[PDB]
Amino acid sequence: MDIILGIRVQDSVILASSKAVTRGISVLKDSDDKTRQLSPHTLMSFAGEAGDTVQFAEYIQANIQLYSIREDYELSPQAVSSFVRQELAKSIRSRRPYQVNVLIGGYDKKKNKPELYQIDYLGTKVELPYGAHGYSGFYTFSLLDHHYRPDMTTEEGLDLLKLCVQELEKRMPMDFKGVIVKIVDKDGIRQVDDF
């Protein structure tokens, strides 16, 4: 875990997540996908404490999928993000809290709008045009403040994202082994294979 980024553009939400899994002085894996599809038009990326991350992500995934089957209907990104926030808000006062930070990228089919939500392990939710967790923000936010525009295309968003990854690869102490990039839009979720 470590680097997860998110950018909401005109017609889509783009999530970028680092591929490295490090334990001690060894990079155990360099192709790890730090994300789960919650519904056809909602994607969640995650980072934090080992074990907790995947356990939390899959638990949320199961609950949203259960809801979808029961009602034969897809929950809105706003509704999913609120559910996720409440679960983390419960968790923080538990005996052993989930130490997991997440980004939720979704396309609302009723509103025809992309939506990006940032939620930390305390249950702190915010809707943003662009978001990050951990030390990633300390480089990207200022970069996005400058170059980001609200009417950008998906291709312009991907170039903006390349600029962030390049800055992280230059100034970050750790080797995070690049990123997996996924796009969320009206047609659902797809992965960019060449990044």
Add this chain to the structure above:
Amino acid sequence: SDPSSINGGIVVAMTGKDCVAIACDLRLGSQSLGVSNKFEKIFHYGHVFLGITGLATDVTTLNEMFRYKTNLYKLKEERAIEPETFTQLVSSSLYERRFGPYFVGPVVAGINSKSGKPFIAGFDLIGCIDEAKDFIVSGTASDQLFGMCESLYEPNLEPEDLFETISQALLNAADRDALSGWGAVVYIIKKDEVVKRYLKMRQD
């Protein structure tokens, strides 16, 4: 790792002549890192207004909790909750978590619909009601707000004048606090009209 100063933020409330004002900044951060400049800390249930500073997760949770409770109140009582009653509800709910408290600094503001009397109140994180004729302050720049309010405030201000006083109190207090600012909102509240104004302030 001090829960009340991780996210930052401030709220201030004031009374005037047949009116009340409540105002807050828009910053939400993670210590040094500014994260959001759209995080409003003032909510309302009917005509009763609640501002909440402190740990942002608890701010959100309590809003959802008091929306929950004031909705059930209205269904059973067949009338909107008043500021005096709501103040007691906030106090009870916070004290229920005496040895595991929400890390917040709430502020109630509103006008009683029956009597027409302007009302404001403040609480500590565990429910102690602080009632005041003049003003209530809360947040990471509370010292600064106390200083500004105590000097700038005078009684029986008209809505238009009260707006200037509360705005200047918040702005100049926020600019002496690292964890507060990044925009501001002011609510002017009369008996049957409410105006909301976003202020222009320095964005550092």
Add this chain to the structure above:
Amino acid sequence: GYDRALSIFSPDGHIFQVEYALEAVKRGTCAVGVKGKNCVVLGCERRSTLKLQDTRITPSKVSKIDSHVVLSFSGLNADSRILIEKARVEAQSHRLTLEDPVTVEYLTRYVAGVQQRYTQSGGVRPFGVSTLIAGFDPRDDEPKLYQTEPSGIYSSWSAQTIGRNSKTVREFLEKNYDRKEPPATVEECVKLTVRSLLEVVQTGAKNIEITVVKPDSDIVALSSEEINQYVTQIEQEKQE
């Protein structure tokens, strides 16, 4: 807690509460399941003493347990919701632990086990419900159709019916369904299912529901006009 043993044996060796639960199934609206060469079709009767109904929002007779399995039933409608809910939860729990969706046999075995438990637990009565459970196993193209009943027994069927006048439609299916050659296409399977319901139903208007399930989570419900075309075609061939 309420402890009374409600389901007990009688001198002749019968458990009347389980048998009386079957009578509730016999009272319920007819439900039929037919499986073809590459599909399963679930047909359901809807009684026409209820006009002024809102079919948009009224609970459908066939329920999705997962994206690849469906469940219909005959008997007490309220009782069925409890079984459907538990089944849906177990389907998601199975995906979570095994990292694979349930087989139709497994899902059936779970539902039947719940029904059985209510026949020897204190303070509860059996479910007044029999179910038809149909679908396709993950990465498999062989059609599956299972039946369950209040006692808790379950089994696989080439074709089966449950509910009121089910003995009549079972008679029809027994001479019209060839084991050596099942309905080769979707059309053939739906037609045989509609034909079997037309022996019992009344009118082929808004009384028959049809749901077709195909491999790889391909489930769709037929509309009124689509079903009415089968009804119109069958009657014209009958006059001969």
Add this chain to the structure above:
Amino acid sequence: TTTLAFRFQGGIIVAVDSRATAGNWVASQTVKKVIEINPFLLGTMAGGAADCQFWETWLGSQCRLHELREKERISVAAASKILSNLVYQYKGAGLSMGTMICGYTRKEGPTIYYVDSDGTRLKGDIFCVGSGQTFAYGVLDSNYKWDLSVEDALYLGKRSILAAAHRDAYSGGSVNLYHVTEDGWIYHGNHDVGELFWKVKEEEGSFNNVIG
């Protein structure tokens, strides 16, 4: 400990050392660090000896119950997840485990899952676990190809453990080799480092740091 397992054209190689240590005291030189969960599934043991031994034999009992209930051999994914979900319940209690669940099935093919006591679960082609993992990685990474022969791959797994056994003070004793195929796992012997080192030195010409 040093344990590894990797995927290749001919299936999965699993290689482990056999040393147990209590501080600087060498407790044993003959520990079985491959647990024969069942004829089709192997588990490797690193970290707490008891923790690994107890819960992986328990895992075998759960896998047996699966095939009795479902009339079908358990998947590598499902087997690994039973173990990971188990240790996750104990998270924070102080369990110490670094394991690798290795197996071959029809639906999955050759599969390796890394599972540890803080709840991590990772599918992957190559993993080295233990106090000498880094030494094993060095040899393994600089010499691994998917197209390795069953013969060559067996040697590389053996040679990698030997590299760690030599450098890591807390790794040694002997090498235990396993080959995992569809048909199941095949044992490829116990190789004492006492004789194996000098044999490899002489025949390969490596280990020049050591006084010959």
Add this chain to the structure above:
Amino acid sequence: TQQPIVTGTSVISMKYDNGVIIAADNLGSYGSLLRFNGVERLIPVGDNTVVGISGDISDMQHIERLLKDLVTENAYDNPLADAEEALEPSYIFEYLATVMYQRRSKMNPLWNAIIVAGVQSNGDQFLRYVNLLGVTYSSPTLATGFGAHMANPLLRKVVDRESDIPKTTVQVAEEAIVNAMRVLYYRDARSSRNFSLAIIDKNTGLTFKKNLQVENMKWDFAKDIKGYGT
């Protein structure tokens, strides 16, 4: 988790040819304050067993009540309570040992060191130790606290191994015990001059001696000692 408040010091004991002897002083210390002087730390159970207890006195009084209750419970529905089905020393010890280990395992120990001395029904001598940790052991001589460091060496000169037990009379054994109590008064800062002594013999039974004093002490040489060197 506890800390002892009012405490009793050494309990000492040994086997002889026909039975066992056990002794302990009558002091209840309160830290460095020698608070209570009338404290009996030897407690007989029936006419064949004596339980000697050191450590926390509040826990000792709790154990007294347990042993008292054990005698009552054993008498229930038991026509042979004063004969074949009477309480043996081995039964009494195992019960206490069970309790001590259970209490340490709940992290709430009885803060004591206990020596059970007695004679079995077949005439065999019984002498066994148990403490707050649930640790148990047996030996021809047994002692707690300072007694372990100073009494055991003296008592082992009389009975050094099993074969010395038949060769040791009650007169010689008692003489060694009384001598050991004197040495403890010389050298243990939480000991008193007053003590109790009990003899359990297979022929003459239980003899309980109260209000004994340490006597024949050597102090005269103190007058010749002047200064600390020069």
Add this chain to the structure above:
Amino acid sequence: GSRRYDSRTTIFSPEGRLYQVEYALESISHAGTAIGIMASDGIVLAAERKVTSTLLEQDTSTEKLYKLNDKIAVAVAGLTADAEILINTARIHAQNYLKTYNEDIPVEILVRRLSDIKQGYTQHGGLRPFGVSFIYAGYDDRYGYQLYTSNPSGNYTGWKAISVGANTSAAQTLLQMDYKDDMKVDDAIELALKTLSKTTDSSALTYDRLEFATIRKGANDGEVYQKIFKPQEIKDILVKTGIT
């Protein structure tokens, strides 16, 4: 022991019926009639109060029509005390959903959960069922305007127009006769009152023996309003349609 005095409230008859459910429905059939009619631009709820006394305080009274949230209401037929237990549970459930998802609860989800509670009392616990039938009238952004009913069995169904309580047979025939799909709210108001007027056991239908409510999108732009009618407003609507 206590076995002797157990009525066994959750068992089957030889014919496969639930005794207590059937007998609870028989109780509901004597309760004041309640009608629900769903139009394209709103929903009407109409209910007859049980034989009124002239000294009953009519304006500050609530017997038949209850508010669950801002978008959903129910008409009651049966034991009022039983209904209020269920109503409070439904109100709480709606707020739990809003708290969890930050969205108003869909109508069916609220109905299903309330019906599932009724079902439980027929299958376990050894307690008598709730002697209550509901007509649910509500709106959400998925299905728009919706009418449902639930009964002591815990079975619920959707409707265009439906009656519960007394004289449902006669009331349903009359609704089936005059109802059509393109109907407006004001027409539905007239149908609801006309139906009660003909099916009533009283001599003549008056304002003091009625409760009335509408759920329209008649507010200002794309939002729903709940109107629980006042006594004087019922008096006026009764004159406007020419019943009195």
Add this chain to the structure above:
Amino acid sequence: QFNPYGDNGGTILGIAGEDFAVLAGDTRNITDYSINSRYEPKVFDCGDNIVMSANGFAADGDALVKRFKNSVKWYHFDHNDKKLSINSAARNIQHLLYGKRFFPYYVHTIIAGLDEDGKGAVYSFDPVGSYEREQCRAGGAAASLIMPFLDNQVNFKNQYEPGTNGKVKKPLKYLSVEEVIKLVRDSFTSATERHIQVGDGLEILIVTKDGVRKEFYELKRD
């Protein structure tokens, strides 16, 4: 603060032959620098030709042996007087130990007996239930002194055939009961010399198909 553990010293040793097995242990029991008993046995016959010793903290040691002896008793009651094999006893003991994983028995456990083929068997355990069959194992305070000696004399480590250039090892062979007892006695006398917590007496339990036999030998008492 109360410390629920203690150290009672002493050392134990198990060796397996072809058709026999021995489990030896000194009889000294200690706390700190004091002797509690010169003869307190800690090697026990548990029935079914199984001998056992749990060395370290004696209270935990006695509790474990007590529980295992009881486990053997109930195994007979529940399984028609079936003989508990050494491998089955070993697995059972693992569950006894691991049952207290989060408040462990502070002991090193060794059991000895015959396997189901009649061949000598020794099993050794860690405090929390990790176990392994071995030809040879020393446990307790002087384990570090004795174990490397056994590696050299039982398993013949570091010994090569004279004249072979260190090419051919000295080959492994089973030792007679006479030879094993010699190694046990010499191991303990050496440990007695160089370890303060070891001495007083040595008790050896020998297990054959005929039963369990005992032998006792004096050790230095200083």
Add this chain to the structure above:
Amino acid sequence: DRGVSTFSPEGRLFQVEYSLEAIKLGSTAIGIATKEGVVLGVEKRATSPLLESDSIEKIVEIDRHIGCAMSGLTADARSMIEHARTAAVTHNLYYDEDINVESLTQSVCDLALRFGELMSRPFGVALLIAGHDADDGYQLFHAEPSGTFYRYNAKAIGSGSEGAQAELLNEWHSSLTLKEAELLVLKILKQVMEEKLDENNAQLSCITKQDGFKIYDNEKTAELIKELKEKEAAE
């Protein structure tokens, strides 16, 4: 009404006696024990021709060395089998060995009387438990809802049990081969079954030391049926 755990004047538990009547209504199940193995056979009895008979599962594996056949209210047997499998595997975990057949049966029978006012009624199913262990060899057990179990050389349960048991009395001897036992189960099943016996409405199984518990294929059973018919016509 009356208590569930009540005794009759004759000294029998009403509910246990009534559950025995339910077992008499069940389909036939036969077991025969030999020195070469134990054979278990059952009548499937499909209620309708449309029912796919291969899904009827009345013979079941408990462990590799223990099998099980059932008769009566077969749904009740699911939790009994679940307990048996757990008991067998748990014992292997605790003791690193196979569990004795008798000890397995005793564990299942402990559930039987755990009913009253625990479950609400006794089980309405009888079990034939067949297996092998090193101590007592090949064994067959009849487990009732009374909590009682007898060991048998041969045993029939179900509707045609009294007739089939009388036939087993004459036919069984201590030198029967496995093949002889297989034919004998088929013969006696054909005699007591309503419908004509074939590979689809009957099922065979066995347990041997070497290969463990095995349910036979429909192809394998069909040949044994054909072998049986030829041998009866041959004299």
Add this chain to the structure above:
Amino acid sequence: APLX
């Protein structure tokens, strides 16, 4: 406390 045996490690691997």
Add this chain to the structure above:
Amino acid sequence: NNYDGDTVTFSPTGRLFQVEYALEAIKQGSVTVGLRSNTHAVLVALKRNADELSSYQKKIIKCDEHMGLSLAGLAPDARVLSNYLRQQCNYSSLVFNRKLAVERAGHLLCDKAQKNTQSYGGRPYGVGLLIIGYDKSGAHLLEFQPSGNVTELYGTAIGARSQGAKTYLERTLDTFIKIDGNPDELIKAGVEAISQSLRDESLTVDNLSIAIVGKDTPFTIYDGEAVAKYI
């Protein structure tokens, strides 16, 4: 009649019919005999089969090295009660390092059976037990009835036609009580006693079940070819 629906109800004459019906289950059970001398105590038990293909139901159960019983009636109830005795014997050994007195064993069984006769929902035990043992006060024989009543005897019998063996032992009292230091002769007397309860059937090798405990003899059971000596 109206007072036998459960164990919590007294009849007008002060009877507990459910306890009496449980007593009836013992009468239907197969005969078992108990007798003792001053040195040894012996149990003899006639085992019963379902048919010629079945095994013979085991009647005797071991509780400790020095104690055990025989059963007549519901066998599963005996298993529960014997299991309780095994635990109580075991508790005495682990806690007090003390062998449980046979008299205390009886008192414990009495109190366990009693609680099942005074509470709603439960039922009485449907089995009778003959407990033999050797403790610190010599040999003992006890008779347990599920009413709760436990009785210490020189000899007795329970089960069907147990009156014959009970009459025989009443005549033979003076003889068999003085069979000290001779196990085989005490068994012979017990085998002759149980023979007075036989009708149409005789004692065979897989039919007879004998158990013995004494001064220098742990509780051991004899079945199969080991009882051929006594036929």
